Design a protein around this ligand. Structure first.
Ligand SMILES: [Ca+2]
Length: 274
């Protein structure tokens, strides 16, 4: 009855879980298209919306629901399993139904998360340009003790071209690139100097609008795996800081090749978790 996406085992999230660490008491904010809060495999505890005319608890685009799924689909007898199923989930709608949003809605969501005490911020979501405001929000949030994770981008590689997007490019933010179930880098992952870690991003099965499950591809799918991994670590060592959580993830990642295409490699929550 319950399915275990290949992604959880690959990052060895299952092993931290077996020890009894599942992100209990860790507050994760998912900055996306919202979340079908009525899905039976999810438990959204709150949030807000920065998008005109849409609450935060409806998702007219499946995207935000799928990502919310990778972090926290409940541990039960139905649907899927999230990396940190006992997390406190907040849906912050910063993107519209068609998948786009303004810097201003985006910076609003960041600020709401910092302010409301969120421990992790997932932004599956990129842009070719940053702003001064954005950099400020992210830096500040990070400085204020929040672990900020973002999708690196789906721009592939072209020679020695850096293709990493905003906000992943900011050094206070963890840029996540994508691998498949054979730990091979996916073609769509952005490349560049700022790439930090890899997570499963190809053929990820998760929660999808109207009480169902679907498979999606993208760096967007990769990022929540890392947000989840952060929450696992924190439930084990609640004393750790954002930079300490960050160093654990990158310094214990499985080496896959050149940093340009892979960062420090594929995350290993068991080694990271200590
Ligand atoms: Ca489930």
């Amino acid at each position: 009855a319950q399915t275990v996406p290949y992604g959880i085992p690959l990052i060895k999230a299952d092993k931290v879980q077996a020890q009894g660490f599942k992100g209990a008491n860790v507050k994760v904010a998912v900055l996306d298209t919202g979340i079908q809060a009525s899905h039976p495999d999810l438990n959204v505890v709150g949030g807000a919306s920065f998008v005109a005319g849409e609450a935060y608890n409806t998702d007219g685009n499946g995207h935000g629901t799928h990502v919310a799924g990778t972090v926290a689909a409940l541990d039960n007898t139905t649907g899927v399993l999230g990396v940190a199923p006992s997390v406190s989930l907040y849906a912050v709608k910063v993107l519209n139904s068609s998948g786009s949003g303004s810097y201003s809605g985006i910076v609003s969501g960041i600020e709401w998360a910092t302010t409301n005490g969120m421990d992790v911020i997932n932004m599956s979501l990129g842009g070719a340009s940053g702003s001064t405001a954005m950099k400020q929000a992210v830096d500040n949030a990070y400085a204020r003790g929040v672990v900020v994770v973002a999708a690196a981008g789906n721009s592939g590689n072209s020679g020695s071209t850096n293709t990493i997007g905003y906000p992943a490019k900011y050094d206070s933010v963890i840029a996540v690139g994508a691998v498949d179930s054979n730990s091979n880098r996916a073609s769509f992952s952005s490349v560049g100097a700022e790439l930090e870690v890899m997570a499963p991003g190809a053929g990820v099965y998760s929660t999808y609008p109207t009480n169902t499950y679907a498979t999606l591809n993208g760096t967007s799918m990769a990022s929540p795996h890392v947000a989840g991994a952060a929450a696992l670590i924190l439930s084990k060592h609640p004393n750790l800081s954002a930079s300490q959580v960050r160093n654990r993830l990158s310094s214990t990642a499985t080496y896959l090749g050149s940093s340009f295409y892979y960062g420090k490699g594929l995350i290993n929550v068991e080694a990271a978790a200590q």
